[model samples]
Target: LNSSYVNGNTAGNLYNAGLFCESDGEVFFSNTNDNGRLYAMNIDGSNIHKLSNDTAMYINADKNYVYYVRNNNTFFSYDRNSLCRIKRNGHGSTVLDPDPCIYASLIGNYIYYLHYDTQTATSLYRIRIDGEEKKKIKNHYLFTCNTSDRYFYYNNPKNGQLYRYDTASQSEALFYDCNCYKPVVLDDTNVYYMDVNRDNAIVHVNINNPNPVVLTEANIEHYNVYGSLIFYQRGGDNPALCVVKNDGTGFKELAKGEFCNINVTSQYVYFTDFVSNKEYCTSTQNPDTIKALQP
Candidate 1:
């Protein structure tokens, strides 16, 4: 699922997007308009519905709840105040609402986010699902964050630096410093990021080693890393999806699209197109095949 911006003349004209898999092969995504709702559909793109009417953003879901961000502007104007949570049958409450600026990421029981004050700088914060203890740890703006079983990796886009926050120590350290975009932690020892200066090659940084390795130099635009494979979008005269091993071998083209923002699940790789406003997927087991999920 992905959020889609609609051309409109009113405020909050973007649709809250989400994707879910049914027991069969059906896939559902939110496809509501300004009415603010969700829709479930089949894999062949059939059934649809207006699930709800509450305004939502950044929709993500798990087994228990369909998580999303809801605007909480009391004045009902263009206020950016938002609260994050999981909605059950369209009636749910807040998970966390740190005043100033709102951004959240849900991982297991803890929600990690950044709270920024216009007067002061930003800080990294975390809170449990029960809302017992909310604490701010680092005094820096976090552009993006991802979690592993042992550590939390974040990027300071302002300084072009990557950092790892110890979940136990509540401390942060510099992982690497470069003009990196979209840093993803594949595991404890391997970190994959895009170096905007190096022809957008998916660069690899070994946390255990000091040197950086270039995984692919095929003029790729956006990419994602899973276990031992690196899936990237090759953009050029013939734009298509491609994959390379972690050792920079077995490079192969999978699909054709103006793909951006690649994501990998256990079985498939997903991507979106900026020009077409569509999402596509391909089976990781066979990287040479492609399938379009949206139009």
Candidate 2:
């Protein structure tokens, strides 16, 4: 896809945060085995098989291959890594780069990503997915990034500054900044960001307004805004999941769990609890609809 959000980072939930996995009638996910492995499964969660043994970060998939950063060198670990790909049926494993990598995403034939050098800190780089023509983009390092067909937006990991790049003009500019992680999130026309210093909440800069406004005060580690609600992680390490109206109304406590991967669709929030290594779901409109999912 040419979308920036999908091409940005893959640590987010399925809705709009990160790009860990993908769906196309069939699907794949990072395995709960915690060995940095990946697994493939049907839409109904059956016929599962190990996709790869290499540890992965920022995962991706298409019809034929699964692409991701292969986890290497754990020293406070990561932000330094390698690029890899494998057949969807779990063969033909390959490594594309040996440099230090934080995260990356795919757009067209190019893989745009963050590279870390010991002396240079972090910088932006891009390369062909087939492993050719690496070029330095000469920009600050980012933990996360995404792109539209023509524009790119990323969060500066060093300061939470949000920047946008136009592919047509080959120009870049600052949009806004905050002191947060995975700080800037883009909807269709608005860029939503977090400001813990302002009020410990989420705020948005509507492209139409040219200024930021408070959307909610739910301090979360991760958040995804699909329609009118915010699905987010409420605590750290021992995290809990919750949802609220865009204006901070109808705050609902769906479930409190640890080590979760949260995702949302039109009617339900789907998640896998790493601690229990099981999958679950909850209705967006009804708490009683929450239940464990069957394979």
Candidate 3:
């Protein structure tokens, strides 16, 4: 469930990884340094390299290449982002599509993307890397989607429900009613999401039997799950970063104040301080061991 065309194949936070991709011990991300560009570095934040000077968003990667939406500055504010790809070595940059795309993920043989049809419905589309077999996968508008080998896990914001599309059976099911929070993080076996106003707390649904479980009570603003733990922000004016285990145990506050863009690696929880606009980190196993995460 942690995989998306926007985040990664594993469950994670897109806000923290925003157009920034992590793969094979390397992190590929997008940022603005006067002008927009694609950047890369080690997962530990070292040996940084700039990949392209094209203004971009929604970064994605496979073993072979990095895919992104290229922004075209227009006078009428047109939604004309071109889907493009470049070799991992910063060569062979090519434009794959001239259409607009919100998010995308590279699945087995195709790239699954979210695109809005200006006059019709928002849809899911899949296109090959060679620009062949461009097809629409579904009609439902999804905020985000994660996948396993057999199913597609995503949410339809219009109907306030979470859904699963079974690729094997070619069927669809209402996985759960998540009218509260929209985003969902997934592992190989479970889909993790949240509820508002103490309705269900931090919850996970077993993708196998479709079992539902709550792991927290209230004050969950935003969250992400990694390894055996879930890192979340407590709701209110200045949200506090908090953590809990998958079995609904060991609840503790990691940090106080406004923490945004919560992302986790194998080692530390990385986030940005909204109040200060600075990056910070803490050992996931020890909250007291916090430090500034800077290059």
Candidate 4:
């Protein structure tokens, strides 16, 4: 195949925010059913097979290799979390970086990750895919959501203010002054987040003006945005998976359970139900037909 191996939406979704990613019509995922081993399958939920035995997290992939985070240490060793990769064919597994990387995102040719150290706390760092040119970008860790080649969006843990890091000018600017939790960047123009000040309501603020448009008043436990649609978990004594338009219309409940990490692919919407601890997927065109994702 001569097609580009990078998933079309991989850069927007971020590796840390998704358990499954699609590249060139094939889906690569961390299978919670198989002890969180990395696996590959067709986008239509067929031809599934294991790629590696290691428990993979923050899965990111290119043409040649699938990169992930794994401890890969004995109880006494306890390396915490190290960056590792395996060939696309499930061979040639290698530990790229032994540092404690908590979350990673693949943008262009670089693997940007959050390194947590006892002294430095959490900071931003980047390394080339081939394990070279490791550089610390900032002393603050960039939180979840997307990192475009031009900008990195994150929330300040201290003040809960959303900030934007401009990769082009190498400058940091305050984006939104609120307790923005679990923010997701859509098209780098708008940021959707749960407003902790508004009872965990889902809202979006334009990057240019920073005026929030409340999408839903329901308390959200977690959420993900794809195109004009937003899929989220409405939290309470009972959590439910619900979807709505970006403008706050056409609301629909996909499922009722403890769903987390709502990742949307080209063909399906995948999520991990915490109650079952198994990965499941439903066609994006038809959200009601949810089923376990496995061979």
Candidate 5:
């Protein structure tokens, strides 16, 4: 398929502005090299082309259109951030929601995002791809509402307990009672999250067993679960990119530096390095060959 939204990137990638999504052989990304504008390139890092001037983030795309939250500072009219979509040809740009938004997650037929009203209150909302069916899902803003195939998993902001909301039934239920954050669900049964009670340590828990196992205790700034490996950036004075198996074994450092949008693709891992403010990619086969995404 030349144009599609399916299997472009993992749920982990999308959770982080995804910075990058692969459709067919073309990779869609918020080009850090170009001030977070929408750009696309071939899988081999060829045929780079700019799609928009908007500072696009939290991107989700289909064959004909790419959806995202525009954080254009110079944007007039509304606020600096808004949920929007643009055609693949860079025409027909439209605003689905003009309210200031922080994060957006595209699941199924609805685009779920956190909207911050002018009064400083936050809410979760879902809208159809065609800019219809806009509705509020929850009153509180979920910091990281990652989803599996069946549900959107999130941490309650008030108590820090884990919760899951059914997209079909539109009902929420508490999944875990621990003080957790950044819930990353692999499936309906398995979830990975940072336990605030454990020094912000990464832990894996099974919904069936209801027991949590620590994956790592490093000062992690952010992380993503890709396949059997969990890619993360350890915080503090000396930050480094590290990876560990889901089983909490084979922990190893992949790179040393501050990184964001840690997306793991089939053959490579991609991230934006803070020091250089450029997107970089290293192969899964041989991670040593890290290089910047070209112009």
Candidate 6:
């Protein structure tokens, strides 16, 4: 029993944008139609709702709020000056206005994102949940950002350099510079990311040594980390959702898809496909098992 949906070929059907899986099996994603429209559905693929009516460019959701961009030019032209958030159940209000920003990430209470200044210049901004304490730090074009207990980590896309910002000390330090994207920090001890520079391999950077060791050279295009397992999709046609241990062992294939993202709990590995627009789940404890849930 799995959940799934068909992306009606509204905007060329080529760009399936803003795909994300929440921790509790709730799925939120956006489609590139006129501008963009965000959708939310239950884990079992029931109670699907179009959360936003206005044009949205990008979106990211957590347990509390579903953050999205409005009137931006990246996908289409609506206004190009609005950022907003609503409750997961479709409540709340728009918190920030449009300023040509993208790549929004939440740590705990603060939301960090990239504010585009010019074609070549971009900066980082942080704001609290209530939209307070907004400040712009200069000269950082962040491709990806994540935070842990003490430090906020980001990558400079221009130089492929990794940097960490201290939350308490308000200091910045160079962590490492390599070709990586989609960085997810589980904790200070281990950081997991897809090494796009090297065959789309999954790599782990040990914070103590600050060096990357290849966990799997399996051509991963995207991934999500849950507990001690990293679930990733291979980067090619007819891709399959696969999982491996954090240390890079116990490699196993769980399900098949043309394009997908994974969300896992203690018992299940959940994924959604772009081609079929279907969501499915399988037992994590048994790699050979597959169950197509109703979406």
lDDT of 3 at 171: 69
Ten-residue region with minimum lDDT total, candidate 4:
1-10
Task: Quantify all predictions' global Cα lDDT against the true fold.
Answer: 0.55, 0.60, 0.66, 0.71, 0.73, 0.59
**Tens digit of lDDT per residue, candidate 2, span 22-133?**
4565556655444546776675556767777766656666556677777664212344468887777778888877787755666555676677766457677877767887
* Highest-scoring model, lDDT: 5
**Native-vs-model 5 lDDT?**
0.73
Ranking by lDDT: 5, 4, 3, 2, 6, 1
Per-residue accuracy of model 1 over 195-261 as CA lDDT, tens digit each: 7778777788777775888887657776766568788778778887788888878989776677664
Poorest stretch of ten by lDDT in candidate 2: 10-19
Q: Count the backbone clashes (under 3 Å) in each candidate.
A: 0, 11, 9, 0, 0, 13
Comparing candidate 4 with candidate 6, which one achieves the higher TM-score? 4
- Clash pairs of candidate 3? 1-186, 2-10, 2-11, 2-186, 3-9, 5-104, 5-105, 20-29, 21-28
lDDT per residue as tens, model 5, 104-169: 766666778787765467788888777899998778766434766547778887788988877768
Error of 3 at 104 (Å): 1.2
lDDT tens readout by residue for model 4, 107-194? 5556777887663477778787778888988787776346655566777777888777665465788876778776667654667878
Q: Kindly list the per-residue Cα lDDT of model 3 for residues 1-295, writing each as its tens digit.
A: 1233333344554434344567788777664442446888887767877888887666677777887777776201236677788988999999877787756665555666767687345677877776787888778655443655555566555665777766546567787666546445464366787665465378777667766677876766667767778888776765588888888888887788877667666555676666665667777655555687453
In TM-score terms, which candidate is top?
A: 5
| Candidate 1 local Cα displacement, residue 27, angstroms | 8.4
| lDDT (10s digit) by residue, model 6, range 25-70 | 6766553332346776675556767877755534555556766666
lDDT of 4 at 15: 32
